[PDB]
Paper text:
The apo‐CdChdC cryo‐EM structure adds significantly to the structural knowledge on coproheme decarboxylases, it is also the first reported actinobacterial apo‐ChdC structure. It shows a complete absence of loop (108–127) densities for all five subunits. Missing densities can also be observed for the N‐terminal regions. In principle, multiple distinct conformers of the loop can be resolved in cryo‐EM structures but dynamic disorder that we expect here averages out molecular density. The apo form of the protein exhibits greater conformational variability, as indicated by the lower accumulated populations of the first five clusters (78.5% for apo vs. 92.7% of the heme b complex). The apo form shows increased RMSF of loops 108–127 in both clusters 0 and 1 compared to the heme b complex; however, the effect is more significant for cluster 1 (open loop). This implies that the loop has increased flexibility in the absence of heme b, which is consistent with our cryo‐EM data indicating a lack of loop density in the apo structure.
Coproheme decarboxylases (ChdCs) are enzymes produced by Gram‐positive bacteria that are involved in the coproporphyrin‐dependent pathway (CPD) of heme biosynthesis (Dailey et al. 2010; Dailey et al. 2017; Layer 2021; Pfanzagl et al. 2018; Zamarreño Beas et al. 2022). All ChdCs are homopentameric proteins consisting of protomers of 250–300 amino acid residues, each with two ferredoxin‐like domains, with only the C‐terminal domain having a functional coproheme/heme b binding site (Falb et al. 2023). In this study, we used cryogenic electron microscopy single‐particle reconstruction (cryo‐EM SPR) to characterize structurally the apo and heme b‐bound forms of actinobacterial coproheme decarboxylase from Corynebacterium diphtheriae.
Author numbering:
A (entry chain A), B (entry chain C), C (entry chain D), D (entry chain E), E (entry chain B): 11 to 111, 117 to 235
Write the structure that this text describes.
Amino acid sequence: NSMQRYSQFAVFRAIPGALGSDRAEIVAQAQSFFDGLETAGKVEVRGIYDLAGCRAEADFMIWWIAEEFEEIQAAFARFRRETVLGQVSEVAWLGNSLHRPSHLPSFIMGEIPGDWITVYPFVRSYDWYIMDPQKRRKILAEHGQAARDFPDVRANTVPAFALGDYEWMLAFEAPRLDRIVDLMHKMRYTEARLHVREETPFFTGRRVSEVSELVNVLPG
Amino acid sequence: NSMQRYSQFAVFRAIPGALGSDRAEIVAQAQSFFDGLETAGKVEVRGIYDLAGCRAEADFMIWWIAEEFEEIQAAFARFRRETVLGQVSEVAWLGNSLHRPSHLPSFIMGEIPGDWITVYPFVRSYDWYIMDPQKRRKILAEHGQAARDFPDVRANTVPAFALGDYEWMLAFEAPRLDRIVDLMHKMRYTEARLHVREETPFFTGRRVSEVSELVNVLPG
Amino acid sequence: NSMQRYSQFAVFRAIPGALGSDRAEIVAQAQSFFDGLETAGKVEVRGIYDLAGCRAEADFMIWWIAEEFEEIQAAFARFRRETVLGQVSEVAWLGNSLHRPSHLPSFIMGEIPGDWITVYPFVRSYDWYIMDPQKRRKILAEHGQAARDFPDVRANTVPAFALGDYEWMLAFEAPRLDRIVDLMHKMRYTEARLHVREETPFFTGRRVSEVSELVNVLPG
Amino acid sequence: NSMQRYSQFAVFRAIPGALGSDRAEIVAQAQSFFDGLETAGKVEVRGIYDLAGCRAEADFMIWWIAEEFEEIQAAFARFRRETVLGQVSEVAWLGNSLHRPSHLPSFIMGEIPGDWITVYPFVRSYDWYIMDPQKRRKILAEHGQAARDFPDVRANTVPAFALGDYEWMLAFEAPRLDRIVDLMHKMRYTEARLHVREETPFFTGRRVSEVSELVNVLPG
Amino acid sequence: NSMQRYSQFAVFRAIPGALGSDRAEIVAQAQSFFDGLETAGKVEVRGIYDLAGCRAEADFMIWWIAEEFEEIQAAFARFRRETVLGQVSEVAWLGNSLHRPSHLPSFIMGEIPGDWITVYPFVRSYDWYIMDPQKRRKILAEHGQAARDFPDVRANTVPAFALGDYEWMLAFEAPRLDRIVDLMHKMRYTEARLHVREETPFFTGRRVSEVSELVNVLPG
């Protein structure tokens, strides 16, 4: 541990009729942008995800992590400004979180990202934090134990206070989507469900190897 | 059973002034797209439904089922990309569910789809799943018995965790719409109503024989 | 009784700058459409109401009743498709209900529609239907007694399950609007108010004699 | 008082880029419209209020009162139809109320309107009206007594049942805005706060002497 | 102190495709506008903040304070009217507050603004103000003690009654964003959390030295 890492799930919705039918130059420009980000060494793009078919207001997602938040701001603004892909898309939702130095987030461990991801914000009940620490730790122990049968699903739980309307950001990565569905269904059977205020919206996506795969399927 | 099937209710809203008045080529292209989907053998389009007059933000719906979710993603993106019908429509709502290996969904049995359908998402109360299994099973038995007076209405209840903001997807198919209305009204008289958080939005539609019947009624 | 009738309150909002200033041909076309509906004998247009000044997102309303819901769907689609008035308007809200075979809705009796109408959907509490039938009957008797001092206000309470997000559709018709306001205010003084979940949005309008009166006041 | 008066707070939001930079003719036309309203003698425009800086979706407000509601409808439609100012604005919110024949609204007395106004709708709790009349009258007496230290703030509480989604319309007029802020803060210290369901949105504005002052500040 | 100061957090969202690529003249015009505001001596612009990456519907924010609210209205309208930057932006959210003459807001003391800010509205529970003053003051003392471990984060709590939909405006200024995140997380561990109704939306931003730095990063 002992590392500071802001994380961002930037969710974009494609504007129909704006991308056009000739997309080779757009693909090349977006790929050059991401290669420049990678060679700069400040912002690490953990993944690019196709959100088609998940919900009506989202089309794709970029999950990237940087040591400072201003670097994420610069990368996000540059993506929206200097690339055609960012110019023909609307920002639908932004999930920001900060990891500060037991169990650590999967992206902190450096694990290989899974094929499928689900991402959602999380807000606990008002009395959750002032609850007796004995009871809170027991509830959290049961909640964690409920995920013992899913070693293939990696979980990221990162604090998100003051970086949005939420308190935590949760991200599940799995080779198969049905494993994520089963994990959520089984986690419904826990006492921690009694201390939940907000858990929406959900964003479920498939990791693409390169930006060309994403661009070639966007509408318009 | 012993087969995995993802299901999707893709709801689209027609943009006024975009379809135009000459629709023969649009009809032919949409029919060719659906015939190609059928001949590919991966995605099975269970139905196409006209949602006109049900609610303000919906115009039609496609109910299709595939073994893998990426196939549904590909079909959905292709519909929005390579057909004029998908290019002049906005995605209003997406209801995703996964059926995994009692009483099984109607589309799992392969029953003939009914003339009328009603589709809605469903979210249970926070304490529903950690409730005493005896009490939950008794409540579910009463809820099921309340629907034994409507043998002509087929019910699909499919888990929807992590595939959206919801927990279950419910679909009722009947030859007559008044049967669905009566079933919902009678199902209001059950104890399970005490454990409901979200059940909206509703989408009520009539099954069309072919895409031409749907296209010829959409607003110009 | 012994008659099945679906009812629809189709609420439309006028798009500014689309109707124009020359409206004689639009008036003639809309009148021809409504005369064709009347002469077809399937859909009965009970009223056309001007909603200007009631709320921000509504401009007028068509209240029509038909034996089958397919006929209402067809008439609604035809209005939105083959008339300039329907082409330059957006659907803001749709209230659907079904009357099936005590006290009957005013439109079932065939009473002359009042000059002023108010319309809203209604959703009861979760425990309303499983409440002890004696207590529910007493509450409903008190609620009905509260409306005995307003014989000039006719009330239509029609089930709306599965035809939208609601449970009941309520419509009050009166020669004067202050009578409706007083009736609602006095009905606030009832125990049934303890079993209400949703009762919005409201749509208050004045019945117009012919579509020309409505068209000549819509924003250009 | 033996007078019937409907009151309306019509809130409009200016469309950027539609008003233009040359506004003398627009000012003259709007002033002519309001002079015609005053001459006709049916609708009394109590005030015109600049709402800039109060909230994102509002730009100005017209507060007008008429004996019949159809007169208000005609004036509102005419403003949106036959004036450039009404043609380049969107209706953001409409607050309607009816005053029917103790303490009466300020506009019934005909008091000089204050420089600053705040306006909001109000919805009481479900059990407020069936509460024991002694307890309700005691609560209302305390609530009224809490406003003894603000004689310079005039309050208008008018029933709003069936004329929208609300129950009451509340308007506070003061020479200074800080007096309104202090009054609201002091009214927070009352038992009536335990019986409140809805009190938003708020509209705070400054009374303008003539429509030219309002038009000259709207965004181009 | 005896200083009466209205404060405003004007949040703007940039319209894509409206700013263009040549921004030198826009920068010069905006800088001239802000220099004129500073010279006039009525409205003091406390800060300009880049909000990119915080949320989907916000792009930047202006925090300015003036003795009278009409001066803030004039400055806001003038910014939206006479500058290209204000003409190519939409108002997303407005947070207004009034400070009337223990512990004072940071902007009242004149402290140097921090590099990072987090701004949100706040609404207490209905029974918060009529709670026993002993208990309320004890809860507030504990809440204040919870923030004594963060001397580097300056807090501004200003009443916001009748100037919007909220009750208080809260702003946290820090040299580092992680300090704000930690302060919010630690403040979750207080009894005052039991008396919260609304605390969203949040606006987290980085203070820019000049308007050129802000304009050069906005999407084209």
